[PDB]
Design a protein around this nucleic acid. Structure first.
Ligand SMILES: [Mg+2]
Ligand SMILES: [Mg+2]
Ligand SMILES: [Mg+2]
Ligand SMILES: [Mg+2]
Ligand SMILES: [Mg+2]
Ligand SMILES: [Mg+2]
Ligand SMILES: [Mg+2]
Ligand SMILES: [Mg+2]
Ligand SMILES: [Mg+2]
Ligand SMILES: [Mg+2]
Ligand SMILES: [Mg+2]
Ligand SMILES: [Mg+2]
Ligand SMILES: [Mg+2]
Ligand SMILES: [Mg+2]
Ligand SMILES: [Mg+2]
Ligand SMILES: [Mg+2]
Ligand SMILES: [Mg+2]
Ligand SMILES: [Mg+2]
Ligand SMILES: [Mg+2]
Ligand SMILES: [Mg+2]
Ligand SMILES: [Mg+2]
Ligand SMILES: [Mg+2]
Ligand SMILES: [Mg+2]
Ligand SMILES: [Mg+2]
Ligand SMILES: [Mg+2]
Ligand SMILES: [Mg+2]
Ligand SMILES: [Mg+2]
Lengths: 186, 152, 125
RNA sequence: AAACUUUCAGCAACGGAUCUCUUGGCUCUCGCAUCGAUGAAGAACGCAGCGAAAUGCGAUACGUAAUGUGAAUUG
RNA sequence: GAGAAGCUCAGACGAGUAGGCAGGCGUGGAGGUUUGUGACGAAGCCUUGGGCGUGAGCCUGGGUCGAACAGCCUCUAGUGCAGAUCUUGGUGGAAGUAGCAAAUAUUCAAAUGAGAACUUUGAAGACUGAAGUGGGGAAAGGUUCCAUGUGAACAGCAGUU
RNA sequence: GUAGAGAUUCUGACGUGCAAAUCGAUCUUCAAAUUUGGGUAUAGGGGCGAAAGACUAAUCGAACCAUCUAGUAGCUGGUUCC
RNA sequence: UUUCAAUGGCCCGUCUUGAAACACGGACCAAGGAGUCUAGCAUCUAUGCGAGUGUUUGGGUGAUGAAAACCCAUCCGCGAAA
RNA sequence: AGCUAAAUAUUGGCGAGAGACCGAUAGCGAACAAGUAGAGUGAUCGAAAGAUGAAAAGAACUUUGAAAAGAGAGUUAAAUAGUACGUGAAAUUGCUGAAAGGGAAGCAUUGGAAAUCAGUCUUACCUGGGUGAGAUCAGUAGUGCGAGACUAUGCAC
């Protein structure tokens, strides 16, 4: 006998994508090699995010990219933005600046507006050629907790989360237990 | 039809069989076991003696409750009977095998019963009436019999 | 390939319609090819067989035999041909049936209706 | 030593699984609108050379007339 | 090169009900594919032969048999049994056992017949004993009536009846 | 006291029966509130009852048939390969 | 493979704190035999598109052969505001 | 007070075409003389049961038997298809063979005994040795400029 207590025994991470997309497999093949034959944390970051599910790879819009790369103390002037995910458009940004973006996917509107403003769109394999270790790159992520489910997670007394309701209005969970005039509030 | 065995020269043997014979399977097995291996002439003598209650058929397997007799002594048993209905079917089948051998010109002096087998035929069904308005089976147990005699 | 909505390719229906066909329908079902000489003479590929027609057997153990059609047993889709028999146990000769598709007609029992059937079928006399 | 009992195999029984089949079922879709006092639906009894159940038929009775086909029916 | 879904080096570890997850095995049917198997024997089945897998299972020799069937990638489901006093069918040990003992009772000869305790004839011995084991009817049955034949099944033994 | 109608006791026989109530002996009644054929009426919360919750086709403290109905079960049983 | 010898081995399933139980089911064999389909909801994953998204209520090539494929307008649902 | 087509419905009836459906304990209760046989006074209840073979060629005739049948024969591709008929499992049974057995049997481990099964080896490839005959091989000549592979005409005999 041996007295071993085993808590973090099996690693909890993905070692490969769940996707069967053959081209994603080709990108993983490229970045398995790059993350192994370089000392770059950027390449290990790309390889890890290439495995992640859709909900763990939220989109980012060109407005957020334009805002994140144009801060007052930025120096992120002429550097390529990289996201392992989809780049969407923000139609509210009437005038798009000149941007260099590397992404898994571009929305048709996002791609057209980036190019029309004189910028450039790259796939991740084109990025690997240009910056094989991700030097002078802005690695970005979308907002993970913006999806609907995070309005509800952790619902409970005084947690101020959203209930699961079929309809919204009075008569739909706004009565006893939700106000002082009806027994108690939450 | 196929006999269950061929323990003899095809040219020096004869065959007889009966199917769906309405005589008791258990009694017939005991008769067959006793006459198997006998000479044909002595089998006829023994079968006639069983008819006369001069000799008996030892009941060796299906012997539950069979009575005792001093005629079982010659076979070293105590339980023996005289199932004459089964005896008659065997006597007729043995006569048929003898006639079959006489047709093939075998020497009717060395003929030995080389093979005899009883198989349980499909049962025939009757009913009997039991107390409290019940009905239970009253079946018959007919037999298939095959015999092969051969020169010794 | 069939295209008509009025044609069924159902195996169940086709088999029911074949084995349940009435007597007059079975007559057309029991057709035989005409011989090469007869095809040219009458411009007809095949006909429903008939009693007193002359055929030769083209398939089976009786291939190459010839004779009149003594009877058309439509209930069994069988032709009985003269002198095509087999021996029973007791020496009597039992006729052997042959399918109409397995013979070729070498001489037709031409008569008024048969002559009308040749002209109607586009043939010549 | 047999008999006896037990297991296995061959062969023979008993029984009808398995496999293959299928003029049947089930389901879907398309199309159609037509019972009866001018006696319906249903019931009974009869009708064939040899026919009891089914099909058919009604003392004109496995049918008459009429039309089509064109040599069978068949145990 | 080493199905990169690959290859290679190393260390630690191994109970499990209820329960959870993964990877596999097997079955019917669907799409694709395999100059796929097959009357020179498909499928199925038997086996006192062989091989593979930790296992689910799989392959094969011999026998039997006679008309279809399989591998690989996918699709799909009425998809896997020891149990449910489970269902339907078949078949056992109990067993040649329990038993076939109410209602007095049979016997001799002949005929017939392959065969007679049980048929028929004669003889004897008996019984019901007129509130009958006699002679009719009503209800109910429906051909059971009669003659000639038969004797598989039935007549819980027998059968020429 | 016989026929008929009953059914006390043996707590007899039988108790996988001759029989889902019978058999033997014994016993009750035997000219009337008697026994009984046929016809006829009463039908299920209904009938009918000299009353035992009896009887109403081997069914009765609410018959039998079909349907609602695969009624519901915090309960019992089962729940198929590695 | 069979059998022998030596050593070990209680009858499975089940409910149970606890079954070899003097707890229940199970004589035998075959075939059948039990988490399904549907209207929703929730998490997680994949795919498409993305401030949008959803051709199948409908209409068209359509007659040929057409329950498929393929194409096409206005609404509308959900989302873009509480 | 009143009438009215179409677009809508349709587990009945009639006709038609289909199916990733079931395949004889399944599928309708009924693939078959099925709402039949059978049960109940009645209302009602309600089954079981498909397959010889291409063709009956459905076994002449002889013989034993009172007969049913058996044995010879015969037909058939097959009777290891005989109508008690395709295949023909298991339970259960008879015969034969093998083996074991002092109040259960079965199983596991290990070997003995007996029975039974597989090695097909030393094949391939390489070299040496013996004789044998033969269109004869390395460098080259010529026919896409420099280097490399190939075939092809000859020489190298
Ligand atoms: Mg026994
Ligand atoms: Mg006794
Ligand atoms: Mg009785
Ligand atoms: Mg473990
Ligand atoms: Mg299925
Ligand atoms: Mg085979
Ligand atoms: Mg075995
Ligand atoms: Mg292994
Ligand atoms: Mg199931
Ligand atoms: Mg079972
Ligand atoms: Mg179980
Ligand atoms: Mg049971
Ligand atoms: Mg006894
Ligand atoms: Mg007296
Ligand atoms: Mg007297
Ligand atoms: Mg009288
Ligand atoms: Mg008593
Ligand atoms: Mg239920
Ligand atoms: Mg219920
Ligand atoms: Mg012990
Ligand atoms: Mg517990
Ligand atoms: Mg237990
Ligand atoms: Mg308990
Ligand atoms: Mg219990
Ligand atoms: Mg029990
Ligand atoms: Mg099963
Ligand atoms: Mg065969």
């Amino acid at each position: 006998g041996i007295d071993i207590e085993r808590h973090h025994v099996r690693k909890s991470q993905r070692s490969k994508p769940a996707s069967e997309n053959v081209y994603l497999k080709l990108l993983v093949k490229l970045y398995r090699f790059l993350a192994r034959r370089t000392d770059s944390r950027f390449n290990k970051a790309i390889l890890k995010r290439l495995f992640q599910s859709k909900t763990n790879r939220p989109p980012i819009s060109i407005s957020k990219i334009a805002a994140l790369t144009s801060r007052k103390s930025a120096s992120l002037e002429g550097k390529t933005t990289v996201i392992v995910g989809t780049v969407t458009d923000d139609e509210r940004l009437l005038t798009v600046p000149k941007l260099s973006v590397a992404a898994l996917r571009f929305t048709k509107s996002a791609r057209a507006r980036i190019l029309k403003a004189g910028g450039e769109v790259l796939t991740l394999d084109q990025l690997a050629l240009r910056a094989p270790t991700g030097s002078n790159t802005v690695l970005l992520r979308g907002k993970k907790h913006a999806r609907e489910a995070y309005r509800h997670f952790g619902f409970g007394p005084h947690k101020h989360k959203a209930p699961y309701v079929r309809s919204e209005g009075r008569k739909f969970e706004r009565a006893r237990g939700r106000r002082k005039s009806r027994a108690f509030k939450v | 039809v196929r006999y269950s065995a061929s323990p003899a020269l095809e040219t020096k043997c004869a065959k007889a069989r009966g199917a769906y014979l309405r005589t008791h399977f258990k009694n017939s097995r005991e008769v067959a076991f006793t006459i198997n291996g006998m000479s044909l002439k002595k089998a006829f003598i023994f079968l006639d003696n069983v008819k006369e209650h001069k000799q008996a058929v030892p009941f060796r397997r299906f012997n539950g409750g069979v009575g005792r007799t001093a005629q079982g002594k010659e076979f070293g048993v105590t339980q023996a009977r005289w199932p004459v209905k089964s005896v008659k079917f065997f006597y007729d089948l043995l006569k048929n095998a003898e006639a079959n051998a006489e047709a093939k010109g075998l020497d009717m002096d060395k003929l030995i019963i080389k093979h005899v087998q009883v198989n349980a035929a499909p049962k025939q069904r009757r009913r009997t009436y039991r107390a409290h308005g019940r009905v239970t089976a009253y079946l018959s147990s007919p037999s298939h019999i095959e015999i092969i005699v051969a020169e010794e | 390939m069939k295209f008509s909505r009025d044609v069924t390719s159902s195996r169940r229906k086709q088999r029911k319609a074949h084995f349940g066909a009435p007597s007059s329908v079975r007559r057309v079902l029991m057709s035989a090819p005409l011989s090469k000489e007869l095809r040219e003479q009458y411009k007809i590929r095949s006909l429903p067989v008939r009693r007193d027609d002359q055929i030769t057997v083209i398939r089976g153990s009786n291939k190459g035999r010839e004779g009149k059609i003594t009877s058309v047993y439509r209930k069994k889709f069988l032709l009985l041909i003269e002198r095509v028999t087999r021996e029973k146990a007791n020496g009597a000769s039992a006729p052997v049936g042959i399918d109409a598709s397995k013979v070729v007609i070498t001489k037709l029992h031409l008569d008024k209706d048969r002559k009308d059937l040749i002209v109607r079928k586009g043939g010549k006399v």
